[PDB]
């Protein structure tokens, strides 16, 4: 044991907890200045005692050397797309089809509802709580390794906040740029005679394809987690909402507008609520994502492979 | 000009036409014996004058040498899967969803309805009317080259029956084994102390994975064409039924139980009709395939990529 190793451990623990409170809870317990006091105290100590420098320390987000080219990653579990709807009648027809397709339709039929963000789909791997890899969705089967870029995102934890993390946990989410950050960036680009971005989605997409992590770090990107891929060494909750609440309780940023709605008319109320809140969110959204909440019902319903919307095979009963 | 070249041309033309009448029209104009008289007259002449032997002649279906291994083919256009339904209520919900998803719902809403065969999905390429390649569906993106096996199928034309064939035409269909053929095969297998097949689908699947075309030829396989992939140098009809009628008019076998039905209640009548005819078809079917008939409406509706059935993105209108 040494005093300096204990001082580093305590600084890192404290700093990870303040990041959680600021980014995930939106209720920091100390001012920004106090966080910064400790952050550069940790950075200086680590540089004066490099023997105790760790790769997942809060001061190690930015890789000092720009990359040459992104490697390709094949997803262990593929990243699927979502079916879409454009009207209440269409959504009602979607629910009516699930209602008769299910063996036993429960009363109520609960949905986990969230805003649909206008961002870049990513997959982030934590091995025994530590961030080791991150990838773009790409075509859903193969993507680009953007680990160094993802590590610069301030609300992305380099270490899960739990003493017993899963053996492996793959978090899926969307990287986006909030309005305030997007406006700030364009004022900086114009003030420094550089090109501007047409919209927040283009700015986020451009920031994630930078080969220099130092540029990505200056871009105000935010992750919002909406799913889980691989999950080894853990008993995931049996509802989709409980799984998102579990991600949040271990340090992962999740959207705070997520709700549970019983039946189509409540789900339609949420859609109109979110539609009315658009002017006040501070980030771009394209719609709402409505999912069956009960996990056993999702498994029972399953997936639809790449198929035309204009054909259907009405099979005979045995 | 030579007498023997004219005699070969006339024999081939005649034999291709009798094959069309026997296999596609199910109305042969001559007895089986007359067809055979000409078939082995052509075979003998070709062997006595090998200078005039053509690769697409009716006597050239079976490659004399067994293959070593099937090469892999990547489909230019991917082979999609079908969404499925299991009840009238579910089918009605599927139509109601298309009804509101369409910009302009016509009156009537016509469907091209067919039996769903229990067979092996294949893709067959004709280049300037001649059969050059055939492939298994495989995963929908890549399959196995089964050209030599497909060439042995009696109802598959080696040459399209048209003086102006498309530059390239890819026919999509299912290879199956009718009941009478399946029963015959198992009596032969049992009489020759060999293994039997559990059902016609397993027998068809086993026959198409034979590396020896000589074995496939002894297996009574039938093609039924249900679609078109590549179609260059042709103006395909603007309805799905007209496209199937066009395939049939150029020599391609198409199922004769295909009908047009206006609206869901007529489509449901077809399903019950086919369900009642099952006992009398002479081949296995699993259900019915119901497609929007108008091609512009199919294009408007489009496809659904690999997605969960339990989620939907209700997007906001602009
Ligand atoms: C100078 C400075 C320091 C920190 C921050 C924001 N912030 C604050 C905390 C905090 N309050 O616990 C935690 C993490 C974080 O990133 C800004 C914008 C500027
Ligand atoms: C001996 C023999 C010859 C032909 C056939 C069947 N068949 C008949 C014709 C025909 N009638 O024009 C055309 C093609 C064909 O394959 C069988 C089963 C047996
Ligand atoms: O497979 C999924 O659950 C899935 C796939 C794609 C998505 C895109 C946006 C939001 C989601 O919840 C998504 N969820
Ligand atoms: O993409 C298609 O049209 C398609 C795809 C797969 C099929 C399987 C059986 C019958 C069909 O008409 C099929 N059609």
Using CB atoms within 10 Å of the CB of residue B236, give its burial: 0 to 12 exposed, 13 to 18 middle, 19+ buried: middle
**Which residues of A contribute to the annotated binding site for NAD(+)?**
32-36, 81-82, 114, 137, 174, 291, 315
Tell me the C-alpha to C-alpha distance, in Å, between residue A165 and each of A168, A237, B243, B272: 8, 15, 58, 55
In B, residues 266-295, which contact A (CB 8 Å cutoff)? Answer: 271, 275, 278, 285-292
Do A314 and B93 make contact, defined as CB atoms within 8 angstroms?
no
d(CA A304, CA A297): 15
CA-only gyration radius of chain B, Å: 22
Residue written as tokens 């997942």? A56
Say if CB A228 and CB A170 are below 8 A apart.
yes
Q: Which of residues 295-314 of A touch B (CB under 8 A)?
A: 297-298, 301-314
Question: Rounded CA gap, B88 and B94, in Å?
Answer: 10
Q: Which neighbouring-strand residues pair with B121?
A: B174
Cα A158 from Cα A161, distance rounded (Å): 10
Q: Flag whether B123 is marked binding.
A: no
Question: Of all atoms in ligand 1, which is nearest to the CA of residue A21?
Answer: 12
Hey, which residues does B45 pair with through a beta bridge? none
Contact A8/A42 with Cβ under 8 angstroms? yes
Q: What CA–CA distance (Å, rounded) separates A160 from A169?
A: 10
Tell me whether residue B241 is annotated as binding: no
Q: Which residue has the tokens 């309005």?
A: A179
**Contact residues, chain B, for A315 at CB < 8 Å:** 84-86, 116, 286-287
Tally of CA atoms within 13 A in the half-sphere of B20 that contains its CB = 17
Name the nearest CA neighbour of A113 among A284, A294, A271: A271
- Three-state secondary structure call for residue B174: strand
Q: Tell me the shortest Cα–Cα distance from B96 to chain A, in angstroms.
A: 6
The enclosing H or E element of B227 equals: strand B222-232
Peptide bond into A108 cis (omega under 30): yes
Give the one of B90, B287, B301 whose C-beta lies nearest to A101's C-beta.
Answer: B90
Q: Which two tokens stand for residue B260?
A: 């047009």
Distance of alpha carbon B264 from alpha carbon B96, whole angstroms: 9
Q: What is the DSSP string of B129-159?
A: TEEEEEEE-TTSSEEEB-HHHHHT-TTS-SB
In chain A, what are the domains?
A: 1-61 (1.10.287.610), 81-118+254-318 (3.30.1490.70), 120-253 (3.30.470.30)
Hey, is B66 helix, strand or coil?
coil
For the four alpha carbons of B43, B49, B50 and B55, in that order, the dihedral sign comes to: negative
Which residue has its alpha carbon closest to ligand 2 atom 10? B32
Of A78, A285, A313, the CB nearest to B289: A313
Torsions phi, psi for B100 (to 5 deg): -85, -30
CA–CA dist A250, A236 (Å, integer): 13
Q: Which listed ligand is nearest to A18 at the C-alpha?
A: 1
User: What gap in Å lies between CA A91 and CA A96, rounded to an integer?
Assistant: 9
Residues of A in contact with B309 (CB under 8 A): 83, 98, 101, 301-304
Ligand 1 is surrounded, with C-beta below 6 A, by A 18-19, 22, 28, 30-32, 35-36, 154
- What are the residues whose beta carbons fall under 8 Å from the beta carbon of A311, sequence distance 6 or more? B82, B83, B289, B290, B291, B292
Experimental approach was: X-ray
Rounded Cα distance, A203 and A220, in Å: 10
Please give, rounded to a whole number of angstroms, the shortest distance from the CA of A60 to a CA of chain B. 37
Which one of B82, B309, B317, B318 would you mutate to disrupt binding with A, by most A Cβ within 10 Å of its Cβ?
B309
| Residues ≥6 apart with Cβ < 8 Å to A181 | A219, A220, A221, A222
Q: What Å distances lie between residue A5 and A19, A35, A56, CA to CA? A: 21, 20, 15
Nearest Cα neighbor of B282 from B173, B211, B183 is: B183
Residues of A in contact with B93 (CB under 8 A): 93, 96-97, 99-100
A306 phi-psi bin (left φ>0, alpha ψ -120 to 50, beta other):
beta
Beta bridge partners of B172: B123, B227
Residues in chain B: 318
> Crossing angle, helix B32-48 and helix B3-19, to 10 degrees?
150
| Residues 114-143, chain B, touching A (beta carbon < 8 A) | 116, 140
Give the contacts of A136 (CB within 8 A, at least 6 positions apart): A120, A121, A122, A143, A144, A146, A208
Nearest CA in chain A to B284: A316
Rounded CA gap, A314 and A310, in Å? 13
Does B16 count as an annotated binding residue? Answer: no
How far apart are the C-alpha atoms of B204 and B144, rounded to whole Å?
15
Residue B14 CB–ligand 2 contact under 6 Å: no
* Interface probe with A: pick from B114, B312, B316, B318, most Cβ of A within 10 Å: B312
HEC sequence for chain A: CCHHHHHHHHHHHHHHHHHHHHHHCCCCCCCHHHHHHHHHHHHHHHHHCHHHCCCCCCCCCCCCCCCCCCCEEECCCCCCCCCEECCHHHHHHHHHHHHHHCCCCCCCCEEEEEEEECCEEEEEEEECCEEEEEEECCCCCEEEECHHHHHCCCCCCCECCCCCCCCEEEEEEEEECCHHHHHHHHHHHHHCCCCCCCCHHHHHHHHHCCCCHHHHHHCCCEEEEEEEEEEECCCCCCEHHHHHHHHHHCCCCECCCCEEEECHHHHHHHHHHHHHHHHHCCCCEEEEEEEECEHHHHHHHCEECCEECCEEEEECCC
Q: What are the residue numbers of the active site of A?
A: 116
């Amino acid at each position: 044991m040494t005093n300096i190793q204990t001082q580093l451990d305590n600084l890192r623990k404290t700093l990870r907890q303040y990041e959680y409170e600021y980014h995930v809870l939106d209720n920091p317990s100390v001012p920004d200045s106090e966080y910064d006091r400790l952050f550069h105290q940790l950075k200086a100590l680590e540089l004066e005692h490099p023997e105790f420098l760790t790769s997942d320390s809060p001061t190690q987000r930015v890789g000092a050397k720009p990359l040459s080219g992104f490697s390709q990653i094949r997803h262990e579990i593929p990243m699927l797309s979502l079916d879409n709807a454009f009207s209440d009648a269409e959504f009602n027809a979607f629910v009516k089809r699930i209602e008769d397709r299910l063996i036993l339709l429960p009363k109520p039929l609960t949905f986990c509802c969230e805003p649909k963000l206008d961002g870049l789909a990513v997959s982030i791997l934590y091995v025994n709580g530590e961030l080791t890899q991150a990838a773009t969705r790409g075509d859903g089967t193969t993507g680009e390794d953007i680990t160094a870029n993802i590590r610069t995102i301030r609300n992305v934890p380099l270490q899960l906040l739990t003493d017993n993390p899963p053996a492996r946990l793959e978090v899926r989410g969307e990287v986006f740029m909030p309005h305030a950050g997007f406006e700030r960036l364009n004022k900086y680009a114009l003030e420094h005679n550089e090109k501007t971005f047409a919209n927040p989605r283009n700015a986020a997409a451009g920031s994630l394809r930078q080969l220099d992590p130092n540029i990505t770090s200056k871009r105000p990107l935010v992750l919002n987690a909406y799913g889980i891929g691989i999950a080894e060494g853990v008993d995931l909750p049996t509802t989709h909402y409980a799984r998102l609440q579990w991600l949040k309780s271990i340090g992962i940023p999740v959207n705070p507008e997520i709700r549970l709605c019983n039946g189509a008319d409540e789900v339609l109320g949420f859609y109109r609520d979110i539609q009315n809140k658009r002017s006040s969110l501070g980030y771009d959204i394209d719609g709402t994502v409505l999912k069956i909440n009960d996990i056993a019902l999702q498994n029972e319903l399953g997936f639809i492979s790449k198929a035309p919307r204009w054909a259907i095979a009405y099979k005979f009963p045995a």
